[PDB]
Chain A
Amino acid sequence: QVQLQESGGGLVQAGGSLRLSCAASGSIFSPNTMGWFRQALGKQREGVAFISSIASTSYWLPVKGRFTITRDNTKNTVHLQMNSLIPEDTAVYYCYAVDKSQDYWGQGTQVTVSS
């Protein structure tokens, strides 16, 4: 049984910064790939950005510079650094652990920006 710890959300004004963090404890088998998804209020769920186990990154939105993914090999955790925050990214975020056999999901973090 896998627990995906989500932390680092909340209220931030326009142009602020924050650091989302997902720590995968449990099974999280060795050839894992970690990603982030976006859920806008009452809309579809799109993919924020995915990081693989060979440090290869695949951002699924023209967003480079905004999100940056940092990897912690010692604890197998993933951190999302947010900068230059603009109102159209106001959405809850879940991290996605494909593992190798059964993919998992996070609990949720509220990321909000307005002015």
Chain B
Amino acid sequence: QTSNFRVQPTESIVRFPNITNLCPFHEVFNATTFASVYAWNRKRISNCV
């Protein structure tokens, strides 16, 4: 008994959940009207991709 024989892996597979519920970045950088700098608009971003 000399060595050990192995089957080397061939490909790499990455499976994750389907992409949905993206963070509303399109509502921040693309707005019809912006805000003055003194009254700067602050939006909290959570529970989203």
| Interface 1/0 per residue, A81-100 and B, CB below 8 Å | 00000000000000000110
Cβ contact of B42, chosen from A98, A99, A101, cutoff 8 A = A101
In the docked arrangement, what's the CA distance between A99 and B35, Å? 11
Tell me if B39 is interfacial: C-beta within 8 Å of chain A.
yes
Residues of B within 8 A of A102 (CB): 33, 35, 39, 41
**Distance, CA A8 to CA B1, complexed state (A):** 102
CA of A98 to CA of B41, assembled, Å: 11
A101 to B36, CA, bound (A): 10
Indicate the size class of the contact surface on chain B. under 10
CB of A46 closer than 8 Å to a CB of B:
no
| Majority DSSP secondary structure for residues of A touching B | loop
- Say how far B43's CB is from chain A's closest CB, in angstroms: 8
Q: Which parts of B25-49 form the interface with A (CB within 8 Å)?
A: 33, 35-36, 39, 41-42
CA distance A102 to B35 in the complex (A): 6
Q: How far is the CA of A103 from the CA of B36 in the complex (A)?
A: 7
Residue of B nearest to A99 (CB): B39
Cα distance A99–B41 when bound, in Å? 11
How far does the Cβ of A107 sit from chain B's closest Cβ, in whole Å? 14
Min C-beta distance of B4 to chain A, whole Å:
65
**Complex: A101 Cα to B41 Cα, angstroms:** 5
Binary flags per residue of B8-38, CB closer than 8 Å to A gives 1, else 0: 0000000000000000000000000101100
9 sample A-B contacts, Cβ–Cβ < 8 Å, listed by A number: A98-B39, A99-B39, A101-B35, A101-B39, A102-B33, A102-B39, A102-B41, A103-B35, A103-B39
